[model samples]
Target: MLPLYLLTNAKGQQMQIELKNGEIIQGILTNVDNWMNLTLSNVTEYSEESAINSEDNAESSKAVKLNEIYIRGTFIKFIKLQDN
Candidate 1:
């Protein structure tokens, strides 16, 4: 199956996205366009450095929560969808 097709089917499900700059975002998939751009709700964003040291100091990990967020196609490095 095509990646876009899978993403399209993932709407309303929870997912994790890793960006090119190493940031990680977790949220519920709200929408996805042909360009692979995404809209997510109930988001939690983690910075690269913080994520790496998360095990050592969970509180030190800089996590930002949001009600909703948009991610550009080009900025995404990979996507992790929940198991159906």
Candidate 2:
């Protein structure tokens, strides 16, 4: 098993986690199961349908990462761990 990881993003949001392999994931971390699976993302996964605004207003392809997934500690390449 691998240890849990966390990342504080440039915007001062603490949930930004960028794997050493260059995979940047962001969300409001809810929990980490015994499997080392990280359950992040406050709302649903980022997607076109989850857009905060419609085309008439505005839309977001997401200035953040995508797809909620579970990864073991061994799978994490590295967390570009930055200090707040």
Candidate 3:
């Protein structure tokens, strides 16, 4: 909860977190924990990967939208904070 409290203290801000698997999450700072786990609001997850078609060929890009998400800290590669 300590980590999350820090974000709450600096609420009304934006943050970008990158995961080791190349997943990127951007959202408003909400809550976090000592383990670096995060609970965010208005989050957008971007993951770039080869799109497999029925023909077994790969091509394309995609992104996911999630409102109020929980992110595991261990998968996090880095975190960037944006100030207003």
Candidate 4:
């Protein structure tokens, strides 16, 4: 079972999020809800293509930068926590 109050210290903590489509996001988890939706600040987003292959000799990859982001719980595949 999920702990209803386990996330009390979650805010301001670093974490990584993987999406169902293989996308990855790294950021500070600023907020969460009972539904497990997320609000992240200072995010770095990597596309599926970039994650699958380290790099391409003929191509370049980029990560989108966002000051903040809101992720719906339904689309989340997994979440990994980082040390505070």
Q: Lowest summed-lDDT stretch of 10 residues in model 2?
A: 5-14
Q: Which ten residues in a row have the lowest lDDT in candidate 1?
A: 53-62
Model 1: per-residue Cα lDDT over 1-84, one tens digit each: 376788998899999899999989999999988888899999999976787888787667578999999999889999887876
Question: Tens-digit lDDT track for model 2 on 44-63?
Answer: 33333334444565654545
lDDT by residue (1-84, candidate 3, tens digit) is 555566667665788888898777888777767787778889887753422231364453455788888888878888777755
What do the candidate models score in CA lDDT, each in turn? 0.88, 0.46, 0.72, 0.79
Candidate that scores best on lDDT? 1
Better of 1 and 2 by TM-score: 1
In model 2, what lDDT does residue 33 have? 54
Write down the TM-score for model 3: 0.67
**Model 4: ten consecutive residues of lowest lDDT:** 1-10
**Which stretches of model 2 miss by more than 4 angstroms?**
1-13, 43-69, 80-84
Of 1 and 4, the candidate ahead on TM-score is 1
lDDT of 4 by residue, 22-68 (tens): 88998988888888788899999997678556555335556788999
Q: Sort the candidates on TM-score, descending order.
A: 1, 4, 3, 2
Off by over 4 Å in 3: 1-8, 48-61
TM-score list, all predictions: 0.85, 0.41, 0.67, 0.77
Candidate 4 residue pairs in clash (backbone atoms < 3 Å): none
Show model 4 residue runs off by greater than 4 Å.
1-4, 55-61
